[PDB]
Design an enzyme around this catalytic site. Structure first.
Site, mmCIF file in Angstrom:
data_model
loop_
_atom_site.group_PDB
_atom_site.id
_atom_site.type_symbol
_atom_site.label_atom_id
_atom_site.label_comp_id
_atom_site.label_asym_id
_atom_site.label_seq_id
_atom_site.Cartn_x
_atom_site.Cartn_y
_atom_site.Cartn_z
ATOM 1 N N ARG A 194 -21.572 -51.496 -24.869
ATOM 2 C CA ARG A 194 -21.823 -50.137 -25.331
ATOM 3 C C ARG A 194 -20.579 -49.427 -25.833
ATOM 4 O O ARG A 194 -20.682 -48.593 -26.740
ATOM 5 C CB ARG A 194 -22.434 -49.291 -24.215
ATOM 6 N N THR A 207 -25.114 -42.994 -17.874
ATOM 7 C CA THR A 207 -25.776 -43.617 -19.016
ATOM 8 C C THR A 207 -27.288 -43.540 -18.881
ATOM 9 O O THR A 207 -27.990 -43.160 -19.825
ATOM 10 C CB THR A 207 -25.348 -45.071 -19.137
ATOM 11 N N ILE A 235 -24.727 -50.306 -8.681
ATOM 12 C CA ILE A 235 -25.190 -49.085 -9.322
ATOM 13 C C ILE A 235 -26.336 -49.511 -10.222
ATOM 14 O O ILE A 235 -26.124 -50.109 -11.285
ATOM 15 C CB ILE A 235 -24.077 -48.361 -10.087
ATOM 16 N N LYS A 273 -17.115 -50.572 -11.672
ATOM 17 C CA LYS A 273 -18.487 -50.992 -11.951
ATOM 18 C C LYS A 273 -18.473 -51.907 -13.175
ATOM 19 O O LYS A 273 -18.067 -51.489 -14.262
ATOM 20 C CB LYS A 273 -19.391 -49.779 -12.183
ATOM 21 N N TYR A 278 -15.711 -47.881 -14.977
ATOM 22 C CA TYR A 278 -16.968 -48.434 -15.476
ATOM 23 C C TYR A 278 -16.665 -49.206 -16.756
ATOM 24 O O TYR A 278 -16.221 -48.624 -17.751
ATOM 25 C CB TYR A 278 -18.003 -47.316 -15.711
ATOM 26 N N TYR A 302 -16.293 -46.218 -28.681
ATOM 27 C CA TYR A 302 -16.175 -45.983 -30.122
ATOM 28 C C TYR A 302 -14.735 -46.027 -30.638
ATOM 29 O O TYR A 302 -14.466 -46.677 -31.652
ATOM 30 C CB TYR A 302 -16.825 -44.658 -30.544
HETATM 31 MG MG MG Z 1 -29.275 -51.869 -22.476
HETATM 32 MG MG MG Z 2 -20.024 -42.222 -17.209
#
Ligand code: MG
Ligand code: MG
Ligand code: 3VN
Ligand code: 3VN
Ligand code: MG
Ligand code: MG
Ligand code: MG
Ligand code: MG
Ligand code: MG
Ligand code: MG
Ligand code: MG
Lengths: 296, 296, 297, 296
Positions: free
Chosen positions: D140, D45, D205, D164, D135, D109
């Protein structure tokens, strides 16, 4: 500053035939004393403070202060209100009847600004002489005491000594203590008791200790002596009961749990609170089976 | 059922030197009357219900009820509480002083379940005989009255005839009226007054009408006669002021607006409410300037 | 005075067979929409599982759409959004080459650009092609929102951008948009609240429900545009139960299940990470479906 | 299980004339290596994975794999996607080019169900024979991998060894480690690095380690050796910079900070990412001045 810290219990209020079972109330406090608890909180959220008359509010504080005399247990009386004038009166009453300090929730429903919260708590703090612990629980009040506001009140008022955090946001606890390492941050948030303590918190105000006071007390003292592996191990064991105690709104599950454990003879609420659903009743009783629940 | 619908005003409570300015309160209610308002709501959220003494509640309902006699304007008195026993008494108390109906907010802070909410409102509805309007404002209470609970309450008690919805969720309003088209859904969010009315809502309980009663009245009456394009155009014109009146928590912005317009003689709140931000003060005074504000 | 694509539009599902696009079922589902009063079809959007489609399958589905709709009044509004600005420009130029009448372009997802970045993202797309562009704001899926101010600036600064599909569940934003810019085409992106958005001046819907009930969504939209508001509300209320149940799980899982139960697609296949719903929601979907009348081919 | 733990860095991708600055990229990894970092996360990211071509994706992994050869630093390659077929290919590519493990973000999404999430990750885990770290970043992606799904994947696939967490919910990490104490929970939120580690987390991370790698490296190692007084002090010092690094969406602030410190030679993003506002530019620059930023 004068402080009230350590392992603390948000006392339930047992009802019998629609009235407060006073003798059951004294024996529940004595059980807490005999199980290593550092402080008791009468007539707070878990004690169904909103549905108490003003005489039952007064009477329950008096029982707590008289049952804790001759022990190391402090009485942290609930005295918050969404009207500042009333919260001043409740503060003055708690102090005049021998409470060691007051818990004071942020004003609820009427959504004051951060400025209003400052003048609210400063008015309480400067009218009475006993330690004052702020209480932030935005899911119930509709407002938040910002980190900046808490820190200003801590520095401007000598009676304000910390905050009970029931935000579910450990980022805020990092924020508070990183900028004001002298305040007493209290967990209001049982599932995450250990992470708040491990970041420098100095106590918990717990619902689970109604049921398992000895474990909440051991968790707290392990952490305060930096025995973090033992404190975490207890926090991990308590997770299942810590979560199921909020399958419905507190104190509905905890009072059901105390009744299932035979620690109260009757399972009575005052409306709008009521007994939980049959499925949630079965869920609490099944989580309870794997724990050891200490008697009187 | 007896109903109270149309354009209604959530009255502000003017203070002068910390006590209620009664003369001005009577003069603000007749101003609403002369501008097409169908009903007034004394001592609700916008009237600072949390910081009023029990007599202020009484005299504000009495002045309202009396100023309205000889007009068709009804008095829908605020009578909610988060303790069921108290909310019943306030309902009995409002009828006892000549109210036409009561508004009763969902219990706040103590987070009752849907079962508890139903038994709360059923207890109020069956103890007294005037129309009862539910009020759902989850951002303030910490709880939400489900659509099924509302519909069950509407069908089971004759008194309960609708709900003031301040959730900001037009999906919920479709849900309610698609399953129970006989209830009176009342808007509790000024910015979206027209969309609620165009989906079958039958009135508004407005904060903006304190300042601009003629426009809220026209908006509502145009919509009820299905002149949708006029109701929409007025809703669009009011959008800027509808948002600005909540830059801070109501009733802080609206009272500031009433003071700037010379409609009240002093800008006094009761703590924890206080004067607005300095930047928000300027925002109110500048968008206030784009509308026409009628005098006495 | 821009070129617009409005009215009743359908977010087409993409039927799969043994992991391949059932091209012929895709052509026959479009014909069913055409024969039932639909004004436009949106190939390879969210409901069409755009995230799991190959790039060749993207095109063929637009080409199937453009060609099945030729000789009808039904427009093709091709799905062409991306969270990389360079990619969304290519996807726009591409949908123009294959005959699309306009493009739907979702707000960048996952990478959460600022309002400045969103403006430069859409300005690059709009200035790349001479085709109508409809913004798509769905913050629950993207993690970001196109603010009202950004949408209005894009509408006034670019001739290709002519409106927004709103799946915000926030009628306040729709009031805000049309009160300050009453010339834009606001498109409903939430079927349950189709009528209230039209009643505030919305000029169309991009619907999931019309996959199953195209005649009712089209009639709902056309009643509203002709200001027969009580008939439009009546259909919107009837559709509520199916409108909500179609999102018991993530779209397009429920609608694809409904199409299979109605015999309109021959297999209930998704591409991972999408899969069939739980047994409890399957029963609830199939039980709500039984109170509606569903058109065949 | 084979694991990749400790203090890890989510690498930024420096651009020069719209192109990937490969020689700059190799050197930013050498700086991290020389400052006690245990692993690097290329093309995640923070590396602007969404705007990189598939060849720049490769080249940066190869540069990472070749710069860490002969050191103790492991390469945890970014390989997530919202299409299961693609994430299997990206996993297969990272293994064939010498990565030590893969980071794999939850599908974004398209909002898969928990059933779909299990089948997605099980397909990936059965695709390559290298460690896979999940993750979870619901802000997001629009979805969350539940505690139950994570645990099932951990016990059913031998390659999945941890998660994560970037949810900001310390309750979830208690939930994870109380029921499956053998899993490697990795912090994905810099402000609460210490609380996640103190609760049994095994690494971070970090976005901040791009700028201050020695300090994040020290924080993690203090915590892993249970020097909690030291780890907390560094975490508290880092609070201001940890927050300013998210005044706008990551990686906009961090790349701005790297440019202000002379660590990258141009402040370039790929749209829709762009330079920050002038005011956040000034705020990032102010904060920076109170820390020491090591050079090359
Ligand atoms: Mg941010
Ligand atoms: Mg990734
Ligand atoms: N137990 C001592 C009173 C504390 C205040 C209150 N009971 C409710 C606050 C109150 N002002 C009480 C009503 C009494 C006068 N109306 C309220 O309900 O608003 C609470 O929520 O804690
Ligand atoms: N419909 C075909 C388009 C595929 C393109 C992409 N995989 C973009 C996803 C990605 N490129 C990440 C995949 C490569 C690994 N970093 C992006 O985030 O932009 C997607 O949006 O699904
Ligand atoms: Mg004592
Ligand atoms: Mg407000
Ligand atoms: Mg309000
Ligand atoms: Mg969905
Ligand atoms: Mg959708
Ligand atoms: Mg190596
Ligand atoms: Mg495996």
């Amino acid at each position: 500053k004068n402080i009230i810290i350590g392992a603390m219990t948000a006392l339930i209020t047992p009802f019998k035939n629609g009235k407060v079972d006073e003798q059951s109330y004294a024996r529940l406090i004595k059980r807490q004393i005999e199980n290593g608890i550092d402080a008791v909180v009468p007539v707070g959220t878990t004690g169904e403070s909103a549905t108490l008359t003003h005489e039952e509010h007064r009477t329950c504080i008096e029982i707590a202060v008289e049952t804790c005399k001759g022990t190391k247990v402090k009485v942290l009386a609930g005295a918050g209100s969404n009207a500042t004038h009333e919260a001043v009166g409740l503060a003055k009453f708690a102090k005049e009847h021998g409470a060691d300090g007051i818990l004071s929730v942020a004003p609820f429903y009427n959504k004051p600004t951060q400025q209003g919260l400052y003048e609210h708590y400063k008015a309480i703090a400067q009218s009475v002489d006993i330690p004052v612990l702020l209480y932030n629980v935005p899911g119930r009040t509709g407002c938040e005491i910002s980190t900046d506001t808490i820190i200003k009140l801590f520095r401007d008022c000598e009676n304000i000594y910390g905050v009970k955090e029931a935000s579910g946001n450990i980022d805020k606890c990092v924020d508070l203590l990183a900028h004001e390492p002298r305040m007493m941050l209290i967990s209001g948030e049982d599932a995450i008791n250990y992470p708040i303590l491990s970041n420098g918190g100095k106590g918990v105000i717990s619902v689970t200790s109604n049921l398992l006071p000895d474990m909440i007390s051991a968790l707290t003292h392990f952490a305060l002596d930096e025995n973090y592996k033992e404190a975490k191990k207890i926090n991990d064991e308590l997770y299942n009961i810590n979560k199921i105690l909020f399958c419905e709104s507190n104190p509905i599950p905890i009072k059901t749990a105390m009744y299932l454990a035979g620690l109260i003879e009757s399972l009575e609420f005052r409306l709008p609170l009521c007994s939980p659903s049959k499925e949630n009743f079965a869920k609490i009783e099944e989580v309870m089976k794997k724990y050891k629940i200490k008697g009187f």
